Symmetry: D4
Subunit: 150 residues, 8 copies
């Protein structure tokens, strides 16, 4: 990629439905070239897709959690435990980390009860889990993972 590709990506990361004519006018390059560049970025795996940003609040997803997981160590436990956590409905983020915990899990649910049934009751049965500590999110100050270029 080059300087122009980054400028294109900087626009698409926050507004993917901005018309080709509008993008071409902003960056200052031929539309045909813009189309070619975007197709290449998709072909090369830089742009992996396009998603609609849906307001979780509109779906009543008010029970937001960040759970730290301590594992029972064993050969390749990170693979086994990581994948089991990733399969839980409501879990959108699973990170293998360095520190006093081994995994950080990001999840969303509508209520305390849903969270207990879909998440807590599933996690407690995973053999690779020693224990977990869930941090309830009182307020989301910022959640814009789509912004990769500042």
């Amino acid at each position: 990629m080059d300087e122009i590709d980054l400028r294109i990506l900087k626009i698409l990361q926050y507004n993917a439905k901005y018309s080709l004519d509008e993008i071409a006018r902003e960056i200052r390059i031929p539309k045909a070239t813009l189309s070619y560049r975007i197709k290449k970025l998709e072909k090369d795996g830089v742009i992996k897709g396009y998603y609609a940003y849906i307001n979780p609040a509109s779906l009543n997803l008010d029970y937001i959690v960040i759970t730290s997981v301590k594992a029972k160590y064993g050969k390749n436990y990170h693979v086994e435990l990581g994948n089991k956590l990733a399969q839980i409905p409501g879990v959108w983020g699973v990170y293998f980390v360095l520190g006093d915990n081994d995994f950080i899990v990001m999840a969303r649910y509508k209520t305390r009860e849903e969270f207990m049934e879909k998440f807590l009751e599933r996690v407690m049965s995973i053999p690779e889990v020693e224990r977990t500590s869930t941090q309830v999110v009182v307020k989301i100050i910022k959640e814009s993972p789509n912004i990769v270029i500042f």
Copy 2:
């Protein structure tokens, strides 16, 4: 919203450039109605936008961190500290949480040095910060915040 709106959203959350004809064929409703429903969802704030999912690895964003923040308590410190953390380049997530820490921050950088200059050196000067503990992400097992409907 109704059952049909959810099915539309379930598709748009992972593939927003799927054609109207294809979406209409999958859900089984008139294209004109589909267009109307989508426009209403955007007008009502359910769909807040459309973004291109860019592979962070393609931008060499290999230094991924999850930082826990302990604050110096004071009136409305959550607002003041939260906003200062949110303004840091590279920070995409800022959560006010319950537990032994007060904020959880998600950030991405290309290198250790960039992380130190843009993030660590900025955070250490924020008066509302007591201290922080950064968890380095060794491997991202899953990061699909776009999926709001399972």
Copy 3:
């Protein structure tokens, strides 16, 4: 329930033996209506009972503890462990919680020895327990769980 039911409950939560005539005079409604409303609240399960508030100090209950419990995780451990903790004489509160511990237990005893025999020696034998940490209450500043309406 309505606004009037709440006012009635606000009185009964701290003084259940206040006469019907006195309550009717305070809220300003017919005694017959007050009686009907109270009976309905009991029938609907809002008022689950009436208790005498006994001063624990009068019973020499001077050894007051708040114990945090870390569990050995397993399928439905919260049910099994929670119920075993709830059965211990002297234990009045058992809460399944989010955080670095899994249960918080509230108990009262007359002495250190009674606490050790009835509580500590029982808890240490429960297989679902990894370990516990007991916080001794030096002084109860406030303990009015009966107040549900502020």
Copy 4:
């Protein structure tokens, strides 16, 4: 008090509206004597009152928390901080404790937002507070503080 007083209290602690005739029949003593004994227990401060046990769930009190507080030490900080915590609407229990924290606070609210406005935003402004850690109650297994005699 004597053996008979304890038996009377054991009944009143869970059912204070049980008729005098019924209580007298259960314990086996004259009604006049029972009335005298109860009046004496009230006069002596053993029975401090009578309350209606209201189901918190009926009032939508679904946000239940147990907050640990670390104080900024100073002369008589336990008195000053304890009283400020006790004054917060929704807080029913405040305990000065031994251990890694100095106070344990029990509170109830209807929602996350109410909890943030009435509790979190008030606590963060108290000068005697170093920091706090809130444990969200996922499920109340038992909460019968009225039972003082097992």
Copy 5:
């Protein structure tokens, strides 16, 4: 015991070889009575013995430790683990405690190597031990366990 017994004990707790004539002169009571009182205190188990206070430094006991022990819970583990810890040469204090640890052990050795061989290597083999954390004493500010009356 009475006021006079306490005054006698207050003297014997720090100087047991003070002559009977000197003690009688200080407290103001007949020597025969003083002798009788002391014999009674010994007979009743108040005075369990008389020891020479030996300066540990004179024996090169420079490796002073305070070890916290986390146990593997089980029926009567406090008895079993407590006794095994008490049998270790060099260990003079073993306390069953409330908090994040279960036992506190006080020990003294001449060197790091002696401490490792006699204490660490013995403790690591005790099945009731989950783990321990040893706090090395850099300086003893005060160690006068003989003073029971201030």
Copy 6:
């Protein structure tokens, strides 16, 4: 000192009132020599005194604590803080330690209230104190600091 001095000390550390004739018979040395050796040990500071071992339980000292102290760092804080802690009535041991805490304090009181007034309320006013964590002793398995030679 020599081998004989150690054997003498091994006896005096647990029974200082054992007669000279009995000690001489046990160790096998002339009484005159034994007396000379003991006087020399006292003169050289090896034997710093003789105390009566008083059973704390006989004095109702049932509230036994081991308190960890975190200090506010500053020049020679260990001297200043250590001495202030050592002056508190009821405190018999004060140790400057390595680890997550800076001092370990051993104290004894008759009741919870005495402990709060004499110890807690005094410690909270010491400026060099950041905070403390008190571990209540449920049972003393062993407390024989007089034994220096095993």
Copy 7:
């Protein structure tokens, strides 16, 4: 550098006084070329020097510590605090780290007293220090920082 430079370095990292003839014979290259390559590595800063590995035990350096430091945050505190720690006699390693602590310090002393005077008493006066936790090394299993190529 190339494959040959690495082989040369792999030898020099553990035996720098191995003769040129011996090194040339082992790697299989002309001595003149070996000399040229080594001089270039020194000129380019790859080889920063040559040191004698002295056995710390021979210097009675028996008090080995690894100290974790929590800082008082502020602008560029890592620079200021890091440099002050690095200036302390006996300190050979100072690392700015991610996690619950901010610096890890490696030091060596002959005795507990030397450690207290040269290290502890100096660190406690540094304003940028919140507190520290020192881990005493009981046994060095391995300490070969000179090995950079495995």
Copy 8:
């Protein structure tokens, strides 16, 4: 050793290739005597070798870690676990320590991936490991283990 040996060592610890003539001129002793003294120090094991100080950065060793290890206790676990940790490529320091952890491990790798494959994936399979916490080094302020004489 004597005063002169220490002065010789103080020079060799940072510059082992300083010529004999230069060292003799600095310390003020005959070259023949200097040679004899150095040979004796090597023969006596004081000087265990001579190494080239290679700049780790020149080898792209940018992933620097300090890992704390909690062990599963058992007979001689320190020997077994210590040796297994010492065998891992990239690990240069292994210390058996006192405190909340049992071992501190110092290691170096070129990248996050290398660190995960060579270190993390190996450590997680060691049966004697309960868990670990890795502290990533953001900046090395000082790393001069060769300096044994200050």
